[PDB]
Paper text:
In addition to the CoV-conserved domains of nsp3, SARS-CoV-2 nsp3 harbors a “SARS-Unique Domain” (SUD), which was first identified in the SARS-CoV genome.
Although this fragment was highly soluble, it failed to crystalize despite considerable efforts. We reasoned that the lack of disulfide bond between SUD-N and SUD-M might confer high flexibility and prevented the crystallization. Therefore, we engineered a disulfide bond in SARS-CoV-2 SUD-core based on SARS-CoV SUD-core; the resulting mutant containing double mutations L516C-Y647C was denoted SARS-CoV-2 SUD-core-CC. To crystalize SARS-CoV-2 SUD-core-CC, we avoided using reducing reagents in latter stages of purification to promote disulfide bond formation. Initial SUD crystals diffracted to ~ 2.3 Å, and the crystals were gradually improved by optimizing crystallization conditions. SUD-core-CC comprises tandem SUD-N and SUD-M macrodomains connected by a flexible loop region. Both SUD-N and SUD-M adopt the typical ‘macro fold’, a mixed six-stranded β-plane is sandwiched by short α-helices and connecting loops on both sides. We clearly observed the engineered disulfide bond between L561C and Y647C, tethering SUD-N and SUD-M together. (2) We did not observe the SARS-CoV SUD-like dimers in the crystal structure of SARS-CoV-2 SUD-core-CC, and PISA software did not identify any other quaternary structures larger than monomers, consistent with the results of size-exclusion chromatography and analytical ultracentrifugation, demonstrating that the SARS-CoV-2 SUD-core formed monodispersed monomers in solution.
Author numbering: 417 to 541, 548 to 674
């Protein structure tokens, strides 16, 4: 009932056209699902928001289910309960509950072995060492390695430091390659959208944990989100004790 495939989305459609996508209660796509809806109208996902966990929406070849997140009380049984609402069918999908939602692959496997449906699981397509580097250190590293450095534009202390270092830089949201290569973002976009952007750019990162403070996440919550990155990243945390903490959060 559950089979992992080695193929891309397009290379897996010969088995079924149906895609199972994961959304949150506002109808926003999980980063694992967000890359699967090219050239398809997805207005229907958010049109009927807000949802509750377990709600299912469908249009054409797409099915989407609202899954729980452990930051908001979610457990393994609530994940299983949510997936039971999906109509029985054959689907291409990803393992439910990964990334920010905080479930492990082994937990996702457990949920899907209930298998009213058949699922073909797309491949999740390298872990650089976690460090505790200050902003000056992170900038110098970026400059010489050409790694992409995400920066939250609302963090005034960082923006001013960059302006001093790189006289003449015009900081604006998006990629800015001046002195070093930056991805400037607002906390007024989702963490998922930022992760998908970084994954699409397909560059190695030097970064603080994404969502941590800027999007109200604690360190464990950010570490869960960081699992959705598909690019290598040097992750710089607040202190040496946080290195130990972060690495533990990432592996559970
Ligand atoms: Li973005």
């Amino acid at each position: 009932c559950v089979e992992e495939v080695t193929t891309t989305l397009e290379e897996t459609k010969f088995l079924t056209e149906n895609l199972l996508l994961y959304i949150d209660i506002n109808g926003n796509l999980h980063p694992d699902s967000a890359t699967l809806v090219s050239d398809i109208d997805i207005t229907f996902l958010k049109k009927d928001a807000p949802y509750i966990v377990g709600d299912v929406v469908q249009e054409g070849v797409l099915t989407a289910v609202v899954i729980p997140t452990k930051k908001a009380g979610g457990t393994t049984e609530m994940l299983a309960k949510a997936l039971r609402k999906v109509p029985t069918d054959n689907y291409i999908t990803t393992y439910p509950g990964q990334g920010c939602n905080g479930y492990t692959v082994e937990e996702a496997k457990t949920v899907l072995k209930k298998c009213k449906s058949a699922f073909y699981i797309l491949p999740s397509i390298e872990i650089l060492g976690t460090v505790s580097w200050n902003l000056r250190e992170m900038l110098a590293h970026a400059e010489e390695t050409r790694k992409l450095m995400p920066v939250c534009v609302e963090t005034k202390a960082i923006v001013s430091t960059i302006q001093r270092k790189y006289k003449g830089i015009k900081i604006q949201e998006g990629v800015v390659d001046y002195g070093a290569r930056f991805y400037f973002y607002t906390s007024k976009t989702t963490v998922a959208s930022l992760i998908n952007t970084l994954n699409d750019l397909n560059e190695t990162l030097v970064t603080m944990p994404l969502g941590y403070v800027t999007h109200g996440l604690n360190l464990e919550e950010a570490a869960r989100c960081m699992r959705s990155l598909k690019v290598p990243a040097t992750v710089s945390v607040s202190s040496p004790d946080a290195v130990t903490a972060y690495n533990g959060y990432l592996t559970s």
